C-alpha cells in the first residue's frame, strides 16, 4: 500500500523503464526527444524549461509588467546538466516530504488512481480512444546495436521546469481542436494529462499584520513559503483536471478605473476553491449549484457513453479491467439491465471531495506549515532557497521548521527575521514589477501595495429571475464542503486497486499546436498627474532620509515632502520633544519622556455611542492617512458620528438591490390525491432564496468592501513603522553629540527603551486591527443586510398571495381532512424572517 518514490541521477543511462527518451504532447510527430524520469506511478519529470508556444525573447526580463505582482526572469535557469540534476534531486526530496505525511500520501493516491477517460466528447461511442496526444505520449527505445523503436506510454502527470517566469507555477490541461474551437477534456469530466512547469527554489513571501491572534514577543514579521506546500497546491489542480472538473467561468474581473486600485489577472473560480478558508464563500451559493449540476450532466453522459463500449484500438487491452476502474473512479452503479447509472448520493460525496476537500490551509495545518489566512494578504518580493538539499536547512519530515533546532515553535523556520540562513534575496536584474507614478515631485508605487477592487458585472444575478415551482422540483443541497480528516479515514480503509500496464500503441492523430504565450511585458510606466494630496503622499512624507543627519518632525505634510531632513507626524506632543534639544539634563528623563511619549499617543481607543458594533475606535486614523471630511480638518470623531464607518472607504459602493421576482406555481394538475408536496417545495424554495441573496451579499463584501478595510491596517502598519524608525534615529544623533561621564554606563538602558517602542507600536496595531475588523463587520450586518432584508420582506407577501390563490384554486381537494384549516395557522413561520449569521450559525437548543 505505501507509495514508492524512485531515485536516480540525471547522468544515469536510459533503461526503457524509469528513464526514457520522451515525446511530450505538443511535440506529437516532430521526432524531438527529451530525457524523462518516472518519479512514481503515472507521474513523470522532465528537467527542461517550458518553451511551448513561446519565443526565445519571452524569457528575458522586461522593463515593466502588464498585470499582477512581481515576476522574476532568468533565461539561464535549468540550462546545464548540473542544473537539471539539481532540479531532479530537489523534486525527489519534495515528493518524499509529501509522502511522509498521511495527508499528502492520500493526495498522491487520488492523483495516481484517477486515470483519464480513453476518449472525450469528440471520440467514438463504441471504443476506447487511446490515440490522441492528449492521453498518450511517445518514447524511443534503443537496442544494444543502437536501433531505436517507437512505442507509447500512458501517464497522468508530467512535471517540467518553469517558463519565462520562475516564481509563478502553473498546471494546465491539453486543449483539443474541433471545428476551429478550443476544447478541454479536463473540463467535461473525462480528464486528461496534466502538465506542470514547477520551480522549487523561488518562493513567495507574506507577513503577519492582519491576523487576529498576536504575541508581543513575536510581533509582526514576514515569512516565506515551503516549496513542498507549493507542490501539493499544484497537485490539486491536477486532481481537478484528472476528474475533469476544471472550472473556468464565473471569474471575477478587477476594477481598472481609479488610481488607488490594483491591476491583476482575473481571479478564477478554480483558484478560490483550492486555497480554502473564508475566501471560499467568494463564489455565491448559487454558482456552486450551477457548477454542481454541470458535472452531474457530464458524469451522466459518461455513464451512458461507458455503457456502449465493446472494443478498443489496441488489440491487447482487456476491456473488462478498465470498466471496473472507471465505475470506481466515477462512482457509477449498475441497473438490472447492466447499464451504468449515476448514484447522486455517491456523486455528492465524490464532487465535494475533489473541489472542497484538499485546500492549502488544511494541508498547512496537517504539515505544520504556516500559511496566509486571506487570499488578499500582502505579497512581498520573492526570495530563493539555494540549500534545499541540505538537511540542516530542510529535511523530508519537518521542512524548515525543524524541532531539533528550536525552529518548529511559532513557525520560526519560515520567519525571515530568525532563520536568515535559509533564504537569500534575488538580484534585481531579473526581478520585474509594475510601477505607478504620482507626480504633483513624482513618486512610484508598486502593483502590490494598492487595494484590489473588483467589478459589479462579475457577480451572479440569477437569484433575481423567475424560478418556477412544480411537484417534481428538487431541493438545492446548500452543502459544499468536505473534511480532510474524512478523506484520510476513507483512504486507510481502501482496498489496493491495481492499475494495468500503461504501455499502448503510438500516437498518430494529435495536433502539435500549443496555445500562444500570453505576454506580460510592457514598455512604459503609467504616470499620473494629480492636483491634491492622496494617502501615498502622506506616507511618503513620513519616510526618513537614509543618512545620519539631523532630523526633525513637523505636522505639515508639505514641509516633510519638500524638506529632506523633516518628517511628517501625527502625534502632536511627541513632536514637542524630539525637536527640543536636551541641554544640560540627563538622558534618563530625556529618553523616557520620548519612549512613553509614543506610548500614550499611539494606543488611543474610544467608542461612539451611535455605533454599537465597533468596540474600539482609533482617532488618529484620519490625520495619518488623509481620511477627512469637508469641514472636518482633524475632527475624525465628529465625521464618524455623522457619516459612519463608510468614511474609511476610499471607494463608496451602491448598497441597494434591484428586484427579487416572486416564485410562480405551474403544477396545475390535481389528478392524483395528496399533491401537497407542491406546497412543501414552495416553502423549501422560499427558504433557499433567503440563503442565496444572503451569501450573494456576503460575496460582494469579501470582494469589494473587506479589502479596503484590510489595507487600512497595512497602511497603518507602515506609518507606525515610519514613526518608530524616525524616533529610533532621532535618539541616536543626540547620543553621539552627548559628551557626558555617564555615557558609557547608560548605553544598555538607551537601547532597552528603543525596544519599548516596538512593544507599544504592537499594542497600537492590536487596537487598529480590532478597529478595522469590527468596522468591517459593522458595514455588513447593518446597512446592506438591512438592505437585503428590506425588499426581501417584499417577495414574501408577494408569494403568499400567489400561494393562497393556488391554495384557493385547488381548495376542494384539501378540505374536511384537517389539512386546509391546519395550513392557515401554519403560516406563522412566514411572519418570522430568517436572520443572518456573520460567522458561525450557533444553536443553543
Amino acid at each position, epitope marked *: 500500500m505505501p507509495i514508492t518514490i524512485n531515485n536516480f541521477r540525471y547522468s544515469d543511462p536510459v533503461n526503457n523503464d524509469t528513464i526514457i527518451m520522451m515525446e511530450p504532447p505538443y511535440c506529437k510527430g516532430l521526432d524531438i526527444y527529451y530525457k524523462a524520469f518516472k518519479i512514481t506511478d503515472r507521474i513523470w519529470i522532465v528537467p527542461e524549461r517550458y518553451e511551448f508556444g513561446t519565443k526565445p525573447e519571452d524569457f528575458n526580463p522586461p522593463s515593466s509588467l502588464i498585470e499582477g505582482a512581481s515576476e522574476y526572469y532568468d533565461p539561464n535557469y535549468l540550462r546545464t546538466d548540473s542544473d537539471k540534476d539539481r532540479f531532479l534531486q530537489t523534486m525527489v526530496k519534495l515528493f518524499n516530504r509529501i509522502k511522509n505525511n498521511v495527508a499528502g500520501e492520500a493526495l498522491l493516491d487520488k492523483i495516481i488512481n484517477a486515470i483519464p477517460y480513453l476518449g472525450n466528447s469528440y471520440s467514438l461511442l463504441d471504443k476506447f480512444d487511446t490515440n490522441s496526444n492528449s492521453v498518450s505520449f511517445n518514447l524511443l527505445e534503443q537496442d544494444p546495436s543502437g536501433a531505436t523503436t517507437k512505442s507509447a506510454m500512458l501517464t497522468n502527470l508530467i512535471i517540467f521546469g518553469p517558463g519565462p517566469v520562475l516564481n509563478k507555477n502553473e498546471v494546465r490541461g491539453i486543449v483539443l481542436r474541433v471545428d476551429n474551437k478550443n476544447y478541454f477534456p479536463c473540463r467535461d469530466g473525462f480528464g486528461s494529462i496534466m502538465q506542470m512547469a514547477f520551480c522549487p527554489e523561488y518562493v513567495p513571501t507574506f507577513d503577519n499584520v492582519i491576523e487576529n491572534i498576536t504575541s508581543l514577543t513575536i510581533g509582526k514579521s514576514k515569512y516565506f513559503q515551503d516549496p513542498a506546500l507549493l507542490l501539493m497546491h499544484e497537485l490539486i489542480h491536477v486532481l481537478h483536471g484528472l476528474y475533469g472538473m476544471q472550472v473556468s467561468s464565473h471569474e471575477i474581473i478587477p476594477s481598472k478605473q481609479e488610481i488607488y486600485m490594483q491591476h491583476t489577472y482575473p481571479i478564477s473560480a478554480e483558484e478560490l476553491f483550492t486555497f480554502g478558508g473564508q475566501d471560499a464563500n467568494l463564489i455565491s451559493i448559487d454558482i456552486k449549484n450551477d457548477l454542481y449540476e454541470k458535472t452531474l450532466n457530464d458524469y451522466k453522459a459518461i455513464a451512458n457513453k461507458l455503457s456502449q463500449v465493446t472494443s478498443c484500438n489496441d488489440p491487447n487491452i482487456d476491456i473488462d479491467s478498465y470498466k471496473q476502474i472507471y465505475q470506481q473512479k466515477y462512482q457509477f452503479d449498475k441497473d438490472s439491465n447492466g447499464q451504468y447509472i449515476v448514484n447522486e448520493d455517491k456523486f455528492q460525496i465524490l464532487y465535494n471531495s475533489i473541489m472542497y476537500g484538499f485546500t492549502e490551509i488544511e494541508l498547512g495545518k496537517k504539515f505544520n506549515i504556516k500559511t496566509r489566512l486571506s487570499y488578499f494578504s500582502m505579497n512581498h518580493d520573492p526570495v530563493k532557497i539555494p540549500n534545499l538539499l541540505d538537511d540542516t536547512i530542510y529535511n523530508d519530515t519537518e521542512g524548515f521548521n525543524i524541532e531539533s533546532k528550536d525552529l518548529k515553535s511559532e513557525y520560526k523556520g519560515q520567519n525571515m527575521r530568525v532563520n536568515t540562513n535559509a533564504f537569500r534575496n534575488v538580484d534585481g536584474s531579473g526581478l520585474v514589477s509594475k510601477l505607478i507614478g504620482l507626480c504633483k515631485l513624482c513618486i512610484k508605487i508598486k502593483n502590490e501595495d494598492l487595494t484590489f477592487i473588483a467589478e459589479k458585472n462579475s457577480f451572479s444575478e440569477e437569484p433575481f429571475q423567475d424560478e418556477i415551482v412544480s411537484y417534481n422540483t428538487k431541493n438545492k443541497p446548500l452543502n459544499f464542503n468536505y473534511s480532510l480528516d474524512k478523506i484520510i479515514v476513507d483512504y486507510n480503509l481502501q482496498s489496493k486497486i491495481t492499475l494495468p500496464n500503461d504501455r499502448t500503441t503510438p500516437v498518430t492523430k494529435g495536433i502539435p499546436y500549443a496555445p500562444e504565450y500570453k505576454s506580460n511585458a510592457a514598455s512604459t510606466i503609467e504616470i499620473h498627474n494629480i492636483d491634491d494630496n492622496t494617502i501615498y503622499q502622506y506616507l511618503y512624507a513620513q519616510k526618513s532620509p537614509t543618512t545620519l543627519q539631523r532630523i526633525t518632525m513637523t*505636522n505639515s505634510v508639505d514641509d516633510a515632502l519638500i524638506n529632506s531632513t523633516k518628517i511628517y507626524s501625527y*502625534f*502632536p*506632543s*511627541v*513632536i*514637542s520633544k524630539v525637536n*527640543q534639544g536636551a541641554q544640560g539634563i540627563l538622558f534618563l*528623563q530625556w529618553v523616557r*519622556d520620548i519612549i*512613553d*511619549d*509614543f*506610548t*500614550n*499617543e499611539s*494606543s*488611543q*481607543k*474610544t*467608542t461612539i455611542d451611535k455605533i454599537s458594533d465597533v468596540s474600539t475606535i482609533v*482617532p*488618529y486614523i484620519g*490625520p495619518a492617512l488623509n481620511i477627512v471630511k469637508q*469641514g*472636518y*480638518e*482633524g*475632527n475624525f*470623531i*465628529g465625521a464618524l458620528e455623522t457619516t459612519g464607518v463608510v468614511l474609511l472607504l476610499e471607494y463608496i459602493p451602491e448598497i441597494t438591490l434591484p428586484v427579487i421576482a416572486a416564485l410562480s406555481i405551474a403544477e396545475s394538475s390535481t389528478q392524483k390525491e395528496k399533491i401537497i408536496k407542491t406546497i412543501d417545495n414552495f416553502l423549501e424554495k422560499r427558504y433557499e432564496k433567503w440563503i442565496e441573496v444572503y451569501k450573494l451579499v456576503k460575496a460582494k463584501w469579501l470582494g469589494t468592501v473587506n479589502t479596503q478595510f484590510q489595507k487600512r491596517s497595512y497602511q497603518m502598519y507602515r506609518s507606525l513603522e515610519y514613526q518608530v524608525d524616525a524616533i529610533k534615529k532621532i535618539i541616536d544623533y543626540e547620543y553621539k553629540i552627548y559628551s557626558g561621564p555617564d555615557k558609557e554606563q547608560i548605553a544598555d538602558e538607551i537601547n532597552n527603551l528603543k525596544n519599548k517602542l516596538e512593544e507599544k507600536a504592537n499594542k497600537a496595531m492590536i487596537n487598529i486591527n480590532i478597529f478595522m475588523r469590527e468596522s468591517s463587520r459593522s458595514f455588513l450586518v447593518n446597512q446592506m443586510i438591512n438592505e437585503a432584508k428590506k425588499q426581501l420582506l417584499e417577495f414574501d407577501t408577494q408569494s403568499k398571495n400567489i400561494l393562497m390563490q393556488y391554495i384557493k384554486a385547488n381548495s376542494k381537494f384539501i378540505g374536511i381532512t384537517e389539512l386546509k384549516k391546519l395550513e392557515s395557522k401554519i403560516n406563522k413561520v412566514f411572519s418570522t424572517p430568517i436572520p443572518f449569521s456573520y460567522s458561525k450559525n450557533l444553536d443553543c437548543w
Partner: antibody, heavy 125, light 106 residues
Framework: QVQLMQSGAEVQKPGASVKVSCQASGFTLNNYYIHWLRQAPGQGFEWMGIFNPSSGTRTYAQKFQGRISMTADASTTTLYMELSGLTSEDAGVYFC??????????????????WGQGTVVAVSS | VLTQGPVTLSVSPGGRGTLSCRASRSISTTLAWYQQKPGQAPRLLIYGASTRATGIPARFTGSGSGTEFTLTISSLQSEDFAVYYCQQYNDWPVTFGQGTQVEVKR
C-alpha cells in the same frame, strides 16, 4: 468623593526656582490625562501643559517651552510642575485638571471635567 | 486662536442669550464650554460641541457650524453672572478663548 489638592507656591524673585504639586484623592490616578493650566492677574485662560497618565506623553505651550517640565510618580499619586527661570510674566493662579471618561480606557483624546482650587504663583522685585 | 469678542454681554433676567466662539479652519475639533467665577473652580458646561454632563441644568446647550461655535443659555438668573470660555484644539495642544463675562440685572 473625588478631590485634587495643589500646594507649593509663594512669593519668589526673578530667575529663581520653585516646584509645585498636585495630589489626587478619590480615583485610580494612573488612568487619566492631567493638565496644568493658569491665569494671569487680568488676562483670561491660557493652557500651559498636559501630561499623560503613564507618566507619559506631554506638551507645552509656546511661552514656556524648554523653561518648564512636567512629570509624575505613579507610586505616590502625585504629579508636579517644574518652573525654571522665572520672570515677571509668570504670576497668576495655577490649576491641575484631569480629563473625564478615562475610566473607560485612559488614552482619551481631548476631555476634562474637574479642577482643584488653585494656589497663587507670585513673582516680583 | 479662539475669538469671543466682544468680551462682554448683557441681558435682563430670564431671557435668551448667545455667546459666540469664532475660530478658523486650523481647528475643527470638539469644543467645551465652561462657566467660571474667580472665587470658585471652573465648571464644565458643554463638552464635544453638544454633549452636556449630568448636573448641568436644562438651560445650557449649543451648536457649532463651519468654523464658528456658540453657547446658548435659557432663563437667565442672577447666579449666571460669571465668565464663560470656549476651549478647542489644533494639531498641537489645548487652546482657550479670551473669555466672555455675562452681566445680568442692574
Amino acid at each position: 468623593q473625588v478631590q485634587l489638592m495643589q500646594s507649593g507656591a509663594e512669593v519668589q524673585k526673578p530667575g529663581a526656582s520653585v516646584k509645585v504639586s498636585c495630589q489626587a484623592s478619590g480615583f485610580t490616578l494612573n488612568n487619566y490625562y492631567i493638565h496644568w493650566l493658569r491665569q494671569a492677574p487680568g488676562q483670561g485662560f491660557e493652557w500651559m501643559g498636559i501630561f499623560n497618565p503613564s507618566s507619559g506623553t506631554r506638551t507645552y505651550a509656546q511661552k514656556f517651552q524648554g523653561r518648564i517640565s512636567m512629570t509624575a510618580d505613579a507610586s505616590t499619586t502625585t504629579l508636579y510642575m517644574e518652573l525654571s527661570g522665572l520672570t515677571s510674566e509668570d504670576a497668576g493662579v495655577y490649576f491641575c485638571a484631569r480629563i473625564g471618561g478615562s475610566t473607560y480606557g485612559r488614552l482619551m483624546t481631548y476631555y476634562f471635567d474637574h479642577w482643584g482650587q488653585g494656589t497663587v504663583v507670585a513673582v516680583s522685585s | 486662536v479662539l475669538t469671543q469678542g466682544p468680551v462682554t454681554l448683557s441681558v435682563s433676567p430670564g431671557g435668551r442669550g448667545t455667546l459666540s466662539c469664532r475660530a478658523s479652519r486650523s481647528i475643527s475639533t470638539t469644543l467645551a464650554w465652561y462657566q467660571q467665577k474667580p472665587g470658585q473652580a471652573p465648571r464644565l458646561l458643554i463638552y464635544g460641541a453638544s454633549t452636556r454632563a449630568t448636573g448641568i441644568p436644562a438651560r445650557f446647550t449649543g451648536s457649532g457650524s463651519g468654523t464658528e461655535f456658540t453657547l446658548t443659555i435659557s432663563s437667565l438668573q442672577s447666579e449666571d453672572f460669571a465668565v464663560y470660555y470656549c476651549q478647542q484644539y489644533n494639531d498641537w495642544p489645548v487652546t482657550f478663548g479670551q473669555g466672555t463675562q455675562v452681566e445680568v440685572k442692574r
